[PDB]
């Protein structure tokens, strides 16, 4: 016997207290060690309802990440409001680490174990845990990186598909590696991402087929973002302390979704490194130091896609999707979907 409730959580990790990397440093003083012997209890005959779009766990993880970035990344100048803030900006060690979210005494986290779970509705197979699985706080747009994969089928997550203001979350069942590199030694900000087109387009085709199932077999078409800052019009993410901006036009090639040459092979996305960025915290802009010397390389697993559907009329022929992102709560929802906090009464 229990009921839904909200409570102040606490985090756990396997961060080392000696590491100079920012995620480890923060997790050392803000979190507790990971439970050596975690407990999980299955609940037979229990059909509990979940709702990933109204889960206070999401709001609390966001607050942690806000806190993490605020005291980790030190920009040279901070363009917030009318005032400008000049300060020291040393380059830092940056690599996200898994974080477990746990309930205090008196509460417990219900976990849905349905393979075909789209974030909402009931769950025939429910278990109970003290802490969630290790979740890396990877802040990125358009493409979800280093996350978890869906079992069995690809999952399209949305509160209301008719609500075109809402961001759609595609949950892949097969990871696709993206290879971003800033070569050493002559634009020091020029970069590029390598992606296996044969693997990617094969996946992307399956995504459209899944989108067809949600839209009366209509024609699925991808288009570049209609507008916005470079952080969302391009695939943006942080690699080794440097902010990358990659063009995803080639990642949504409708031609490649419909046995041709040029779609098979290594796709190369042109990327840029910007010192002046827009803060996702909504604070404003922040200028950083020029990129470090040497080879800057990141290899990530694309585990999900953020999409935004178009509105209007005069269609009936096709549905148009554009690469979404911007509100990082979506990122956490893509991982905190199978969890919810309940109070044992």
């Amino acid at each position: 016997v229990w009921k839904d409730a909200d409570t102040t959580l606490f985090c756990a990790s396997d961060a080392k207290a000696h590491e100079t990397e920012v995620h480890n440093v923060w997790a050392t003083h803000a979190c507790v060690p990971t439970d050596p012997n975690p407990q999980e209890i299955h609940l037979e005959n229990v059909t509990e309802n979940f709702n990933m779009w109204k889960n206070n766990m999401v709001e609390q993880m966001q607050e942690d990440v806000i806190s993490l970035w605020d005291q980790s990344l030190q920009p040279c100048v901070k363009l917030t409001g009318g005032s400008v803030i000049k300060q020291a900006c040393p380059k830092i060690s940056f690599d996200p680490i898994p974080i477990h979210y746990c309930t205090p005494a008196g509460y417990v986290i219900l976990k849905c174990n349905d393979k075909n779970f789209n974030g909402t509705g009931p769950c025939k197979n429910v278990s109970s845990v003290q802490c969630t699985h290790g979740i890396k706080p990877v802040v990125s747009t358009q493409l979800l990186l280093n996350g978890s994969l869906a079992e069995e089928e690809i999952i399209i997550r949305s509160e209301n598909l008719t609500n075109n203001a809402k961001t759609i979350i595609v949950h892949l069942n097969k990871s696709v590696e993206i290879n971003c590199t800033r070569p050493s030694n002559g634009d020091i900000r020029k970069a590029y991402c390598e992606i296996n087109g044969t693997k990617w387009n094969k996946v992307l085709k399956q995504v459209t087929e899944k989108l067809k199932e949600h839209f009366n077999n209509k024609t699925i078409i991808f288009q570049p973002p209609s507008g916005g800052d470079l952080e969302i019009t391009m695939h943006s993410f942080n690699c080794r302390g440097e902010f990358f901006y990659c063009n995803t036009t080639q990642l949504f090639n409708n031609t490649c979704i419909g046995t041709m040459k040029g779609c098979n092979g290594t796709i190369t996305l042109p990327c840029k490194i910007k010192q002046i960025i827009n803060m996702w915290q909504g604070t404003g802009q922040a200028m950083y130091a020029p990129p470090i010397d040497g080879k800057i390389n990141c290899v990530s697993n694309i585990t999900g896609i953020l999409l935004t559907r178009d509105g209007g009329a005069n269609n009936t022929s096709n549905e148009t999707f554009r690469p979404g992102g911007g509100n990082i709560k979506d990122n956490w929802r893509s991982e905190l979907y199978k969890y919810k906090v309940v109070q044992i009464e």
Partner: antibody, heavy 121, light 104 residues
Framework: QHLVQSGTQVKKPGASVRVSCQASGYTFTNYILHWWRQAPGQGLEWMGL????????NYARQFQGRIQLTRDIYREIAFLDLSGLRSDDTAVYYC???????????????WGQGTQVIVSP | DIQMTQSPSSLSASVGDRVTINCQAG??????LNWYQKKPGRAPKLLVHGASNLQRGVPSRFSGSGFHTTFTLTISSLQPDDVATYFCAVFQWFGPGTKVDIKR
């Protein structure tokens, strides 16, 4: 909790127009703005939405290639740019705030007082 | 599109009387329906959101109810400043509207 829009403007057919929307009372970066217009003897039609954080937008299918929604996160003011003006574009243009916030439930409050745009030779 | 229908098209009632405005849906909506008051020369005014929740500032004489397809806005005591067209709306989809004046 106020949204003040720019004064009424008159444009020749084929020109362009920019309409501003000055937010006042609330935390500007916390809520989504929608844009609407109502022609005389017509119902309200949605033109697009804008998300103040990164300037993310969602234009109505019939205005794409003409409409540009922008904002100033510091001045806390939204803008609407419509080019290739026609006679049927003569309407009262509104900007409204989604008071629901992050969960995007289209709870529209408050609204702008409405900017009249007249397209005539 | 989401099909929106309001009945009746226009409505008359004396001051202090009860008025119910109906709104139909072409498909399931749940509670995602809002109500707006529209006067000429004035911006739309949110009265009821989430089907039944009253917007802050709006007098309690206004009442919302409904689910799935059927929805109803009720005015317990009609006042002369309630003379306006009333719209039920789902996201960007607005109903045809319902004019309401004071009966004499």
């Amino acid at each position: 909790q106020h949204l003040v829009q720019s004064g009424t403007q008159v444009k020749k057919p084929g020109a362009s127009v920019r309409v501003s929307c000055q937010a006042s009372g609330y935390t500007f970066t916390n809520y989504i703005l929608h844009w609407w217009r109502q022609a005389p003897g017509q119902g309200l039609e949605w033109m697009g939405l804008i998300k103040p954080v990164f300037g993310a937008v969602n234009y109505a299918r019939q205005f794409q290639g003409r409409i540009q929604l922008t904002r100033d996160i510091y001045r806390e003011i939204a803008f609407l740019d419509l080019s290739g003006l026609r006679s049927d574009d003569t309407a009262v243009y509104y900007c409204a705030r989604d008071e629901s916030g992050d969960d995007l439930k289209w709870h529209l409050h408050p609204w702008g007082q409405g900017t009249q745009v007249i397209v005539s030779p | 599109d989401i099909q929106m229908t309001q009945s009746p098209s226009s409505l008359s009632a004396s001051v202090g009387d009860r008025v119910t405005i109906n709104c139909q849906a072409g498909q399931g909506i749940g509670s995602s329906l809002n109500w707006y008051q529209k006067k000429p020369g004035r911006a739309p005014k949110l009265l009821v959101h989430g089907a039944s929740n009253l917007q802050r500032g709006v007098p309690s004489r206004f009442s919302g109810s409904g689910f799935h397809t059927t929805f109803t806005l009720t005015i317990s005591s009609l006042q002369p400043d309630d003379v306006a067209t009333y719209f039920c709306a789902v996201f960007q989809w607005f109903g045809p509207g319902t004019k309401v004046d004071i009966k004499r």
